């Protein structure tokens, strides 16, 4: 019911007095009610995860994809609340970016896939430079555009070779073709590396990162998370190459070393940009699997909630700095937020549990993300890639704990006299409380996805 | 399929070795999207009626919006329309 | 001298905070020629090197998989 929402509120932004801080309240509550009254498709979802196909080219996989779009709706509700409560007229293209991402998580066939990845990429190119009175965003948007164009024709050249070897298009027609003509394998790894532009696999590495630091913080939350889940959710929904046949494992080896060897960083945005890169590199390891999606579906949410959480926490930490950076981007250095525990240390507690999330101390997240990841690995037998994932987790934990160790040393001179800034506090408290109480209901989901 | 791979590869490594003129890079990236259609159309001709040529009319209609967003974003590679700067 | 050895054990941990602190500058110095302006050209030549090295290493793979120096020379950078 997103298309109706888009065509409604593009008419609503038309003939508006450029107040433009109310329309997001309407979009937030509309997506909230749509999720609340559209969760009733979960009963008709799965008897044995029975797929349902729109017109032969679009697929609805009711256990996987019906959870993915619910996560999309959830993080969109969070972003829409984050803009409420500095803005231009933009939520129309937020929603159509969502439309493209949900198409690629529902795309059975490559025509829908290519249309929707390019629609999605155009949305990213636009959102990067809506804040056009920047010199950061002006450079970053054009860089993102040119390389998205290269990676777009890489997509289309992979699929055009795929059409050149087989007159069909659907991966439904791949149907365990076990004679496995070798160019089918090479086409498929080319399509894999094409879709893997967004994760910034270590030869495609640096270019995303300057873009992430050259957007405003209200934007880099949105596009360190949307295509991160989108293209990979496509990539796990259809398991292109059962194993790597050493092509992709090399990409993640040089990634999960060569992006965690990017340790010394003083810029905040670079730091958690590498975080969101390497934790996206994690879930590439079970792109190397077959018949395994539970670890992936759980790891998306039990990563992305916390990614959203740490961005919302360093949003809240602008108020306490006694210096700011540029008009669009407040807090880029780690050493800006030094004595934060002598400020409202409950958010320091939240920042603590969401960074201990990312290092994966057991009783909240890591024994339920990384445990499922490691059981999916060692089910297959990738014994070496286990220990390099462990090395990646330790060295990632080092710059993760860099944030907490700079977070709570000692303040120079700041305690307390203020007014309040709240009513979005329940959002950050909801993400932090769902982060550190998932150990309660960590078995109910184990049954529910066993029945889907 | 020599005819499309050669124009694709030359547009591609023109986009690599482009140490002059941002817009020549931009139009080489454009001409990639017509180096790919000479592959796609002759594969469809060697096969059949409309199976891949539907994707061809899709990539034409979308390559338009590619160049549109690329221009309307290249306008904002700077300040806007024109002011004092350096 | 047993204590002097026990500091050689910190020489198995000090460099984990030092050889990684050379790996960081080595990883951040590569593809950082211009790095404020002109950042398109670095990345474009880089993804050319990506597709060339990766297709060439697929060719290296399916002739003699024992030849595993082409990754180990890439670890010489970081």
């Amino acid at each position: 019911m997103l298309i109706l929402a888009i065509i409604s509120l593009i008419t609503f932004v038309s003939m508006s007095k450029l107040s433009d801080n109310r329309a997001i309240i309407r979009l937030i509550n509309i997506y909230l009610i749509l999720v609340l009254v559209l969760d009733s498709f979960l009963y008709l979802l799965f008897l044995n995860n029975q797929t349902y196909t729109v017109m032969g080219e679009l697929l609805i996989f009711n256990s996987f994809t019906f959870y993915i779009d619910m996560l999309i709706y959830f993080i969109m509700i969070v972003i829409s609340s984050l803009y409420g409560y500095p803005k231009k007229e933009l939520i129309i293209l937020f929603l159509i970016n969502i439309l493209g991402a949900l198409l690629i998580v529902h795309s059975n066939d490559f025509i829908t896939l290519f249309v929707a990845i390019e629609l999605q990429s155009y949305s990213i190119y636009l959102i990067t430079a809506i804040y056009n009175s920047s010199y950061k965003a002006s450079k970053a948007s054009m860089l993102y555009f040119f390389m998205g164009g290269i990676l777009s024709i890489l997509i289309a050249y992979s699929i055009n070779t795929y059409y050149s070897v087989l007159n069909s298009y659907t991966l439904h027609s791949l149907d365990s073709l076990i004679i496995n003509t070798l160019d089918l394998n090479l086409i498929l790894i080319a399509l894999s590396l094409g879709l893997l532009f967004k994760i910034g696999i270590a030869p495609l590495h640096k270019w995303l990162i300057s873009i992430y630091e050259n957007t405003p913080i209200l934007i880099t939350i949105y596009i360190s998370l949307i295509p991160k889940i989108s293209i990979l959710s496509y990539l796990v929904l259809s398991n292109i190459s059962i194993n790597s046949l050493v092509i992709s494992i090399l990409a993640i080896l040089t990634l999960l070393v060569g992006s965690v060897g990017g340790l010394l960083q003083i810029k905040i945005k670079r730091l958690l940009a590498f975080s969101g890169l390497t934790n996206a590199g994690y879930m590439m390891l079970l792109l190397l699997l077959n018949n395994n999606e539970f670890s992936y579906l759980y790891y998306i949410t039990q990563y992305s909630i916390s990614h959203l959480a740490i961005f919302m926490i360093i949003i809240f930490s602008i108020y306490y700095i006694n210096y700011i950076n540029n008009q669009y981007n407040p807090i880029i250095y780690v050493n800006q937020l030094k004595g934060l525990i002598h400020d409202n240390a409950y958010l320091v507690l939240s920042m603590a549990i969401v960074v201990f999330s990312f290092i994966g101390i057991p009783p909240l997240l890591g024994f339920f993300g990384k445990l499922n990841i490691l059981m999916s690995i060692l089910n297959n037998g990738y014994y070496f890639i286990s220990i390099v994932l462990i090395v990646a987790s330790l060295i990632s934990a080092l710059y993760y704990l860099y944030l907490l160790n700079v977070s709570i040393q000692d303040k120079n001179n700041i305690l307390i006299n203020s007014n309040e800034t709240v009513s979005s506090v329940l959002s950050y408290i909801l993400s932090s409380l769902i982060i550190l109480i998932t150990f309660g209901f960590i078995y109910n989901s184990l049954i529910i996805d066993i029945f889907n | 399929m020599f005819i499309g791979t050669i124009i694709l590869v030359l547009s591609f490594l023109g986009f690599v070795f482009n140490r002059r003129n941002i817009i020549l890079a931009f139009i080489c990236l454009e001409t990639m999207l017509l180096g790919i259609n000479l592959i796609l159309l002759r594969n469809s001709v060697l096969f059949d009626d409309i199976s891949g040529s539907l994707f061809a009319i899709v990539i034409i209609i979308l390559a338009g919006v590619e160049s549109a967003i690329g221009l309307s974003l290249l306008v904002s590679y700077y300040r806007l329309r024109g002011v004092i700067n350096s | 001298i047993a204590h002097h050895v026990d500091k050689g054990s910190l020489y198995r941990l000090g460099p984990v905070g030092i050889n990684r602190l050379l790996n960081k500058a080595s990883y951040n110095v590569i593809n950082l020629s211009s790095n404020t302006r002109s950042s398109l050209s670095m990345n474009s030549m880089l993804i050319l090197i990506t597709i060339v090295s990766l297709l060439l290493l697929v060719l290296v793979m399916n002739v003699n998989f024992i030849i595993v120096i082409p990754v180990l020379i890439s670890i010489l950078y970081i």
């Binding site: 009175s133 920047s134 010199y135 950061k136 300057s210 630091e213 050259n214 010394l264 003083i266 810029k267 670079r270 210096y323 950076n325 540029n326 008009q327 669009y328 250095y333 050493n335 | 300040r79 002011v83 004092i84 700067n85 | 602190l21 951040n28 110095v29 950082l32 211009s34 790095n35 404020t36």
Partner: peptide, 29 residues
């Protein structure tokens, strides 16, 4: 090691992946 910044002027220092030379100390129109 450690570095910090509270005053950024005479910008465009080349020898860095990303330096302390920011983008908006003052704008112009």
């Amino acid at each position: 090691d450690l570095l910090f910044r509270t005053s950024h002027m005479v910008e465009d220092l080349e020898t860095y992946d990303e330096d302390s030379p920011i983008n908006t100390s003052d704008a112009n129109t």
